[PDB]
Amino acid sequence: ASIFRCRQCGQTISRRDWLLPMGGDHEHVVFNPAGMIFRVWCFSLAQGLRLIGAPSGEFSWFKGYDWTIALCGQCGSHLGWHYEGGSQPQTFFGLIKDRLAEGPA
Template sequence: MLICLRTSTHYLKILCAACLIELFLISACDQFEGFLLCRKCGFELAKAQDLFSMPSHLAVGVRNDTIAKNQKVYIQLFKNPHGNYFEVITSRTADAETDNVNFGSDSWFPGYVWSIAKCPRCGTHVGWVFTAAKAAFEKAESQISSFVGIILGQVMHEEEVNSLIITPKLYHS
């Protein structure tokens, strides 16, 4: 922080304004917790602040973990009909592509149909978009209309990515 030792009130006003702006920016940065990135290509798929808990009784296992500055994230383990296991986190929204083909069978979230979600940049399967089936949505007004189930192993938080960057050593001659 810049400290100005002038006696003029004009300089003090500028200093106070600069301090307020700095405090505002620090506060805004604390609330924004970064992005979840595609593990394959680094595309920004979802904001960490959009993660929420959407429990399913069909999960074969559950756990809480920390992602993005101590945020408790509800992680569910699901098994598909082919015997594959997926750790899934849920987000209100994500920047993912779907083929717009909805499947009602084998949904891990009863009352929701699903479609495959892919990374728009590299096409990697990153999860599923779950959309409330019309009949179920009309019965329950409080039901969420849609959300994204993101495969935990297909994403990285940007803080994790930044920790992987190696700064080269400086060599002195």
């Protein structure tokens, strides 16, 4: 249980080693304006995604950061968001825990 894959298809996405304690905890539970609750795990790094469009600050869960939707690059499943434009770090990924599968490298 060291690498994270897309639950829907298997695409390699991230690694346990790349978890990022933002504000002291890698896990942040948040809601969007449609009321959907997400258990977001922050990662300093991820691969295998497709980052869609240009960034937006609207509704951002992380102060100082703008977001882009992050899809699985293989199957299109919405896996989370890429955050940029901030500070320490300038960028990171916020991925929806239950949309990944954990397993051996």
